[PDB]
Enzyme design. Structure first.
Site, PDB file in Angstrom:
ATOM      1  N   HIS A 268      35.674  28.488  26.302  1.00  0.00           N
ATOM      2  CA  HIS A 268      34.595  29.036  27.127  1.00  0.00           C
ATOM      3  C   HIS A 268      33.265  28.401  26.709  1.00  0.00           C
ATOM      4  O   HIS A 268      32.351  29.091  26.247  1.00  0.00           O
ATOM      5  CB  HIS A 268      34.542  30.552  26.986  1.00  0.00           C
ATOM      6  CG  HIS A 268      33.848  31.262  28.107  1.00  0.00           C
ATOM      7  ND1 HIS A 268      32.610  30.886  28.578  1.00  0.00           N
ATOM      8  CD2 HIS A 268      34.202  32.363  28.813  1.00  0.00           C
ATOM      9  CE1 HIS A 268      32.241  31.709  29.544  1.00  0.00           C
ATOM     10  NE2 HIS A 268      33.191  32.612  29.708  1.00  0.00           N
TER      11      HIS A 268
ATOM     12  N   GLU B  43      35.737  27.623  33.870  1.00  0.00           N
ATOM     13  CA  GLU B  43      34.756  26.880  34.672  1.00  0.00           C
ATOM     14  C   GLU B  43      34.525  25.458  34.154  1.00  0.00           C
ATOM     15  O   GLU B  43      33.446  25.179  33.612  1.00  0.00           O
ATOM     16  CB  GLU B  43      33.401  27.620  34.723  1.00  0.00           C
ATOM     17  CG  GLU B  43      33.370  28.806  35.686  1.00  0.00           C
ATOM     18  CD  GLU B  43      32.180  29.751  35.476  1.00  0.00           C
ATOM     19  OE1 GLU B  43      31.318  29.453  34.627  1.00  0.00           O
ATOM     20  OE2 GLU B  43      32.121  30.812  36.144  1.00  0.00           O
TER      21      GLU B  43
ATOM     22  N   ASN C  89      36.398  32.520  39.497  1.00  0.00           N
ATOM     23  CA  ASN C  89      35.058  33.018  39.226  1.00  0.00           C
ATOM     24  C   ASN C  89      34.235  32.915  40.504  1.00  0.00           C
ATOM     25  O   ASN C  89      34.029  31.813  41.014  1.00  0.00           O
ATOM     26  CB  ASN C  89      34.379  32.215  38.102  1.00  0.00           C
ATOM     27  CG  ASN C  89      35.014  32.445  36.737  1.00  0.00           C
ATOM     28  OD1 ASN C  89      36.034  33.109  36.628  1.00  0.00           O
ATOM     29  ND2 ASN C  89      34.409  31.892  35.693  1.00  0.00           N
TER      30      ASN C  89
ATOM     31  N   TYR D 231      30.482  34.444  42.427  1.00  0.00           N
ATOM     32  CA  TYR D 231      29.245  35.224  42.322  1.00  0.00           C
ATOM     33  C   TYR D 231      28.460  35.260  43.627  1.00  0.00           C
ATOM     34  O   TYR D 231      28.113  36.335  44.110  1.00  0.00           O
ATOM     35  CB  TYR D 231      28.355  34.696  41.190  1.00  0.00           C
ATOM     36  CG  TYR D 231      28.887  35.042  39.812  1.00  0.00           C
ATOM     37  CD1 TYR D 231      28.669  36.296  39.258  1.00  0.00           C
ATOM     38  CD2 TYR D 231      29.632  34.126  39.078  1.00  0.00           C
ATOM     39  CE1 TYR D 231      29.166  36.628  38.004  1.00  0.00           C
ATOM     40  CE2 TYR D 231      30.135  34.445  37.826  1.00  0.00           C
ATOM     41  CZ  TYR D 231      29.899  35.699  37.289  1.00  0.00           C
ATOM     42  OH  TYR D 231      30.393  36.026  36.036  1.00  0.00           O
TER      43      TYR D 231
ATOM     44  N   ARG E  92      39.488  40.665  29.425  1.00  0.00           N
ATOM     45  CA  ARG E  92      39.398  39.227  29.310  1.00  0.00           C
ATOM     46  C   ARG E  92      38.337  38.879  28.285  1.00  0.00           C
ATOM     47  O   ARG E  92      37.189  39.320  28.394  1.00  0.00           O
ATOM     48  CB  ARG E  92      39.066  38.619  30.668  1.00  0.00           C
ATOM     49  CG  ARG E  92      38.534  37.224  30.615  1.00  0.00           C
ATOM     50  CD  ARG E  92      38.622  36.536  31.952  1.00  0.00           C
ATOM     51  NE  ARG E  92      38.511  35.105  31.736  1.00  0.00           N
ATOM     52  CZ  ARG E  92      37.419  34.394  31.976  1.00  0.00           C
ATOM     53  NH1 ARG E  92      36.343  34.993  32.490  1.00  0.00           N
ATOM     54  NH2 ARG E  92      37.413  33.083  31.724  1.00  0.00           N
TER      55      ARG E  92
ATOM     56  N   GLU F  83      36.137  36.551  37.083  1.00  0.00           N
ATOM     57  CA  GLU F  83      34.728  36.929  36.914  1.00  0.00           C
ATOM     58  C   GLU F  83      34.080  37.307  38.236  1.00  0.00           C
ATOM     59  O   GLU F  83      34.369  36.714  39.268  1.00  0.00           O
ATOM     60  CB  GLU F  83      33.908  35.805  36.273  1.00  0.00           C
ATOM     61  CG  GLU F  83      34.023  35.698  34.759  1.00  0.00           C
ATOM     62  CD  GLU F  83      33.144  34.604  34.197  1.00  0.00           C
ATOM     63  OE1 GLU F  83      32.149  34.230  34.866  1.00  0.00           O
ATOM     64  OE2 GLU F  83      33.468  34.102  33.098  1.00  0.00           O
TER      65      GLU F  83
END
Lengths: 477, 477, 477
Positions: free
Chosen positions: C121, C168, C310, C312, C75, C380
């Site tokens: 991005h 995002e 995404n 985290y 990616r 991600e």
């Protein structure tokens, strides 16, 4: 400095299991070597095919060594259990595996390198062993191989015009089914273990491979070679044997009987369309699986295009008195590395079983050509120097190459042997099968903790030896 | 900081012999430099083209320096004697030679680099020299070259849009046949040796190269350009000369006469379709081979698309009192790196003959454009630093690159000269011909013992000097 | 050791501005980050996007890391500013920029790697910001983006089968136009600068990306996908929130309210064709630009194929007593990294905001699938280690990767979630935006003075994690 043709295709050679690693990656399934390496206690010196050189991941690092070395062709092999991710005929295909090899072949062509591809190099899919006994089931294994071969002709045959079906069938038969020193390790004469029968099973495994080859050659000859325009062959090894007592009729006879029990076994069906050599039909039974008129039918519907020849060393043979056991496969012979008069077959590498015999090599090329005699490519020829990365200087290896090329030049120009090419074993330091990572055969030093590869002196010089043998009305102008 | 257009192709240059090595492998045969380098006593300072940078085997490593450096284009040379492996016309082609270059072209395009191919860079086939005198035989060589060129247009021309026929034809002529310092090493006025005649031979070789060019541009214009769409050009050098005594008649005249014996010799036929500059037809005989009506027929049945310019330095030229010998080739002149008011041409690199003169570079461009005047690509420009791998810091080279890009800019926007590109000499450190490996011209330091390459400061900074000269409506944010 | 599917495409991710460098090269015009990074005083800890990793020039070195790591997919992100060298729709198209990515795509393919392309991005062309406010201008920006998306589809769409429109959208909106910590740095509430209005601007910038996505997916579904056969998605982030005090009905409600202000905002139009989540329409005004009937026209005239996620870390939301200001974008919430009973969300990386929370990751997966619920790719996921090139030993990152892959296995085979792929952030150590080069997120350590890359242990090991979870009928032999 001794004339090799001009065309003459030379390059380096590497078996699949010995360098690839990535054993469970790519959707590959296990080979019989994936089981043999993990036996307790280990029969493989405690050595593994996992990781190895990590070629699967570092292939383009190695292929750039191929242009650095000036190689013209590169002989490698496919991992059967990586393409049909184990079995054959009706089993599913591993698309990821086909795609991995398809990008190696592309990688190579991009670089100007000739891919030479070997379909089977001892790494039989495990499932086929458990399913029906592997090379012990002649009827089944050759059908499963024929499809596999054919898939490969389909998926890689428009590129790749140089095929080798099976690599050193005698080792797969004898070490795998008589002495058990190689996978699958079956025998009656070892420790041991669970199963084996060295009196009948080697001669089955041989016929299964013989027919496996015949099948694939028939497929290639009839349905592919016209449109794809390529070669196909088998590669046989075999030491040259000259008599122990030079002045003895019974040992000039015993040395040739050995070379029919090694090469004749396979070269008679695959090149002469005759069946087994008679010296060999007369010792073994019954125990020798007969070639039926249906077998010569597969054999006589296709040409095997060349004699691939693996050579490393020679030996002296001398008779038996006594009446041999069933468990004899050499053909009634005591082999020596010394003759009558104490003198050795000559100069050693060690190992110990391999020693440099450059003029018995020449003798070998002249016998093997005419009986049988198709053109000979030398598909494996290499050496380990006696004795870290002090290994970058390998003067023994350089002199081994030079002297063995000198008798290829000699064989060609004085004996009228057609030799067309030469692959040096190996490109990298390998797993030397059930010898482990001990022996270092390659012209590149592989650092097994870093997986780092630095060239040995031999790699950078071998291109200069070939360059100085081709010319030749320019050794002037 | 000082606008270069927007298009403006830039990159690096290299010459076949200077870097490739693999002199005997890949079926290549001897160029005349292969004989010149191996003379005893050496006329090349004990130096060899054997190996050199070994670019035959490390070419792809070198090409990743090309993308590491941000290069947009890359000028390099073919080895005539590697393709037609000695001679031309009726001679066999070396397929291994043609495919070697095939994969360079391919490797470049893959990296987005624009291959700029020089066909001839001083490495005439040796057999051609022995067979009829090489460039001394005008009627043969130009025919042998025409076929050679035509082979290249066929094999590489669907890729490859940008061609340069001959590199610095003036040096090959004068240093090759008048002074003997370059191969093939013939002259009357040297030691020596066996043959030569500086009275008559450089003018033959001149015309032989002029006609070889015409021939190839003929072929390209009529038979390939329409379909292949691209440029063919010649790349000439020549120092800029201004009067030694500024204040005075016979030097304003002496300097320009020297710039006609050097550029106009070749430029008059190739660009203007005139013959030899008359100040030259008038000093040389007779000794100056006439352009026949059959030659203006080849010349003006095809167009040379650009003026490739090599430039390194400049000088003060000035006259003869006395009536000049037969052995005077500069055009009745003795040249200085000093005017009489003492001052130097400006700032030296050493070497000692090459000093950085950015002012006169600009005057040059303006002279060279309009007379003759097609777009100029600067096809070589570079220097060696005053002074190990301390060489990584090359501030001199950078300021050299900077001040000459400045005068290019200046010549474009103030003088209205069309200048479409800039190739820096060199990508690597070479064999600087008969000077040997000593002079380091490259923006990459080559380590001749390891063959290791590490970039110099200038390699990483040049990409940035260009990016900052091309904008321009975004210098606003 | 915990089954992931079989297909399951896994690989590494990187953003455009974060690694590329070459900010002026290739005719690339400035992005909004180009200005924000060079502010005085710095809003980015003194950090710069120029150079960074210099991947523009070293892309083949990193792609070789790709196969060494055994990646299946990669990616990456295009630089809008580099393709359309600044603006949209009627602006010129930078050819040197389109050919640059065409050769990344080419190179990735050549290695067997699947290109996954992120159009946007966070690196909006600066020209658009100045021309009409960029994202604040819903009408113009969604139009300039549709042209951009389209051209990409055209020029790269026959290679490249997997598209991500925007990466995002929440962050670009809230950090870009509410708090100002990211480019372009507008807000009512900060340091400072001249403009902003967090009351209204973040909600405009949200709608504008929603419609930009909608536009692109309109184009792709109607004109390209039937022939080009591919996927298009958006990749949405957002922590998982569970209630701060377990035993409490008021904010089993507020956690979910915070995830609707963070995901539902975008997910409702883009996947359900509902408009804004009720709770959000009912806190914000007025200030939340309504979805016209013509917007739901673009929207349900094309479908988004998959949910790029995404993830985290995770968190405890929970309440406000107080009536919320006009400048609250979170959804009337105070977010903590520990609940009432003292205990933390679990295990720190540091940073400090990113904690390893695999348990709630599974709950996240379960919630996001079923509302909304298309197949999910983790586009991600990664972390920095707690703490020089002692970084090569990253046992926390490995333990992070392992636990979070366990949750994916668990979510699939027990919660009935479709998860099809996983990308690990990041391949290299990046410019982590306004945080600078401080935080090392990569599985390859990058030395920012040498631009040298050397693998951390996670890199070499990750490929074995995936090998070990895919099989599966040979888990035996």
């Amino acid at each position: 400095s001794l004339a090799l043709p001009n065309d003459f295709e030379w390059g380096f050679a590497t078996a699949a299991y010995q360098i690839e690693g990535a054993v469970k990656e790519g959707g590959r399934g296990p080979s019989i070597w994936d089981t043999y390496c993990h036996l307790e206690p280990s029969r493989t010196n405690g050595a593994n095919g996992d990781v190895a050189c990590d070629h699967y991941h570092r292939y383009d690092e190695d292929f750039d060594l191929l242009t650095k070395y000036g190689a013209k062709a590169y002989r490698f092999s496919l991992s059967w259990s990586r393409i049909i991710p184990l079995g054959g005929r009706l089993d599913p295909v591993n698309e990821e595996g086909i795609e991995f090899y398809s990008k190696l072949i592309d990688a190579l062509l991009r670089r100007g390198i000739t891919p030479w591809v070997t379909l089977y190099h001892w790494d039989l899919p495990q499932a086929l062993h458990d399913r029906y006994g592997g090379w012990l089931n002649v009827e089944e294994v050759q059908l499963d191989f024929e499809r596999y071969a054919r898939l490969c002709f389909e998926r890689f045959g428009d590129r790749v015009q140089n095929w080798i079906t099976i690599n050193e069938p005698w080792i797969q038969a004898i070490y795998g089914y008589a002495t058990g020193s190689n996978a699958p390790g079956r025998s009656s004469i070892n420790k041991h273990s669970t199963e084996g029968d060295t009196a009948t099973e080697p001669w089955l495994a041989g016929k299964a491979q013989i027919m496996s080859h015949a099948r694939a050659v028939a497929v290639y000859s009839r349905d592919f070679r016209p449109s794809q325009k390529g070669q196909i062959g088998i590669s046989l090894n075999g030491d040259y044997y000259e008599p122990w007592d030079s002045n003895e009729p019974r040992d000039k006879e015993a040395a040739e009987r050995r070379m029919e029990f090694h090469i004749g076994w396979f070269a008679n069906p695959i090149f002469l369309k005759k069946d087994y050599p008679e010296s060999m039909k007369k010792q073994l039974g019954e125990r020798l699986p007969a070639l039926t008129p249906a077998d010569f039918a597969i054999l006589n519907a296709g040409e095997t295009d060349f004699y691939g020849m693996n050579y490393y060393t020679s030996q002296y043979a001398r008779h038996l008195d006594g009446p041999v056991p069933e468990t004899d496969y050499l053909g009634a012979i005591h082999e020596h590395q010394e003759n009558k008069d104490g003198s050795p077959v000559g100069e050693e590498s060690g190992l110990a079983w391999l020693r440099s015999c450059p003029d018995m090599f020449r003798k070998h090329l002249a016998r093997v050509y005419g009986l049988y005699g198709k053109p000979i490519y030398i598909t494996e020829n290499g050496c380990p120097c006696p004795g870290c990365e002090e290994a970058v200087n390998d003067p023994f290896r350089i002199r081994y190459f030079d002297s063995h090329l000198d008798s290829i030049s000699k064989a060609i120009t004085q004996d009228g042997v057609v030799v067309k090419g030469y692959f040096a074993w190996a490109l990298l330091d390998n797993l030397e099968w059930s010898d482990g990572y001990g022996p270092r055969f390659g012209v590149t030093f592989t650092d097994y903790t870093t997986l780092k590869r630095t060239p040995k002196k031999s790699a950078l010089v071998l291109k200069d030896m070939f360059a100085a043998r081709q010319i030749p009305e320019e050794l002037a102008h």
